[PDB]
């Protein structure tokens, strides 16, 4: 009987910093914007160069924010550089130098009075970053027992949802938002690193990788009877070796490859579609623009209705941890399509209809905060863990390249698009969110299969046997 070691629990922690890492430099830099814009503003002038237009800010702005998601894009898409070469605990070691590096350089930009400094720190650390939301779940996919692994995979999104919250406290300007110490803020993703770079040579490399990628088997059957409790695992074992003889009988996977063979084109269009399901959303919109929506709907103090809603962002993962054995995948990841269907239906509701009648405003701070709850319930956590669930071991690593990828690119291309929609249809833009997740609920329940408590040897045989 298989049980839920400190050793375990030691292992999928340490691997969550990463999450929390993510987290954390994805929500850091909203709180200092006005700061830094005036760091852009005295930077450029304490040079030979005249105050910069409303239009320069903007764009000094724009970039230090995006360039992160850049660096993020290019990062989960090189994940399969470094998994197979390195293993997956060495990965996670060796990446934190990207992560130590670009904090410093976010650290100290303001001593050395460069934007480029800051600039290239976001884009450093967008990089390590795109390689750890790759990392996480494939270690952690890879260690766990079948039976906990949804759960066990829902820990790498709360790492993200208390990386954020932590990011949103610590902006606030009587902690580390202030004009002083805002370089600390962004430095501060240091520290989590150092912590993780020191555990992680006691954490075990994948079993799954020992046994079948590099054909250990005897280790790898004694890092799983220590890191379960049992000397009982000769069900695990055999499936790996499955796993094993399949993979030496199939060609090495390209990320083409994965598009070109009928029975991983399935497992990776499902993939991709559950990312774009999560982004697609309108997460990014709502959490930015939160502030001022919330603002525009009379909250007084709108900031911490926004830390409200990183709490409320917190709780629900939570929720989704302790539902996702029992409930599945299929269940948690529609219900949260649905519901937030609902939440972005009615934001553009009690948008229009606001200045008219009464209460909607207190109708609309609802509609963002249950939103974020739906949220949390599926779509936040599922697609992030899925992925390594849809492929055995062999097409794992450049199935996680392409999905996470995608889910970065489509997070860009939110950030990007969405201004100029709102600008066009205002509170009717929401509509367009409404819109994908509709769509999505319906690919859910029509085309993606439960993967709760089943093998990837099991999973990946019913892709095969749908191919024929
Ligand atoms: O502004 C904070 C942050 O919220 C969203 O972050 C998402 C993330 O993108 C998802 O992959 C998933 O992990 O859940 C997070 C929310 O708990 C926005 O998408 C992100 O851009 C934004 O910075």
Known sequence: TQKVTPALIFAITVATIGSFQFGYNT???????????????????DKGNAPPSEVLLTSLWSLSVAIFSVGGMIGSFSVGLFVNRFGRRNSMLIVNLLAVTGGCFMGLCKVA??????????????????????????YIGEISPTALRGAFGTLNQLGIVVGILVAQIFGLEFILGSEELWPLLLGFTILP?????????????????????????????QILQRLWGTQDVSQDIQEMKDESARMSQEKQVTVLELFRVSSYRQPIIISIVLQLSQQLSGINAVFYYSTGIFKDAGVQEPIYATIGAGVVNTIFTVVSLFLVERAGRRTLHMIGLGGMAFCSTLMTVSL????????????????????????????????????????????????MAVAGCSNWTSNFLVGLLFPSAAHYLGAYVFIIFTGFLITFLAFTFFKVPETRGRTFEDITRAFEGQAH
């Open 113 to 138: 009075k460069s934007v480029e400094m800051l600039i290239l720190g976001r884009l450093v650390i967008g990089l390590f970053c795109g390689l750890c939301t790759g990392f996480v779940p494939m």
């Open 352 to 399: 229009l209809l606001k200045d008219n009648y009464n209460g909607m405003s207190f109708v609309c701070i609802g509609a963002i905060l249950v939103f974020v709850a739906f949220f949390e319930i599926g779509p936040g956590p599922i697609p992030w863990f899925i992925v390594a669930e849809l492929f055995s071991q062999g097409p794992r690593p450049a199935a």
């Open 27 to 45: 929500g850091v830099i909203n709180a200092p914007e006005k700061i830094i814009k005036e760091f852009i503003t005295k930077t450029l002038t």
């Open 193 to 221: 690193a150092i912590l993780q770079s020191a555990a992680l040579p006691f954490c075990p490399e994948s079993p799954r990788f020992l046994l079948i990628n590099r054909k250990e088997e005897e280790n790898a059957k």
